[PDB]
Structure 1
Amino acid sequence: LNAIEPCVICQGRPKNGCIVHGKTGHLMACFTCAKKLKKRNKPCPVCRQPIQMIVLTYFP
């Protein structure tokens, strides 16, 4: 699974930065890297929809 691989962007942290759009979320980046995508106004790298928010996701 992709779930046990680290952030695709930095490969140094877990995939805990949820990219939220609508009623759906893409998990592929950590919170820090995912925040950077939103700041720099990038769309979701996966589905290319706009990023509504970044949620720090715990899986606990």
Structure 2
Amino acid sequence: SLPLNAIEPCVICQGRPKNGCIVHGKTGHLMACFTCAKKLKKRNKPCPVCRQPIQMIVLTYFP
């Protein structure tokens, strides 16, 4: 939960770091990778929590 050093992996594959912040309209998701995000995007999946259809994925870094 820390604002630093918490460079944790994905929530589905969990093999790779959480580098792939996802956005659906005006809100987004944390703790999933670019791979898992790209997969759910190609499938056009409505978010498993927010239920919103995703729009984009970005290369995500830390301070």
Instruction: Give me the TM-score of the superposition, normalised by structure 2.
Output: 0.74
Ranges of 4+ aligned residues in structure 1 off by more than 2 Å:
1-5
Quick one: distance in 1 between partners of 2:60 and 2:23? 11
Partners in 2 of 1:46 and 1:16 — Cα distance?
Answer: 19
Cα RMSD after superposing both structures: 2.5
Higher-Rg structure is 2
Cα pair distance change 1:58/1:34, threshold 3 Å: same
- How many pairs align? 60
**Cα–Cα, structure 1 residues 2 and 12, in superposed 2: closer, same or farther, change >3 Å?**
farther
Aligned pairs for 1:18-57 (under 5 A) are 18-57=21-60
Instruction: Please report how far the alpha carbon of residue 47 of structure 1 lies from its aligned counterpart in structure 2 after TM superposition.
Output: 0.9
The structure richer in helix per residue is 1
For residues 20-58 of structure 1, what are the alpha-carbon distances to aligned partners after superposition, in whole Å with 9 as ceiling and x for unaligned? Answer: 022321012101111110001112223111101111211
Between Structure 1 and Structure 2, the one with more strand by share is 1
TM-score relative to the length of structure 1? 0.77
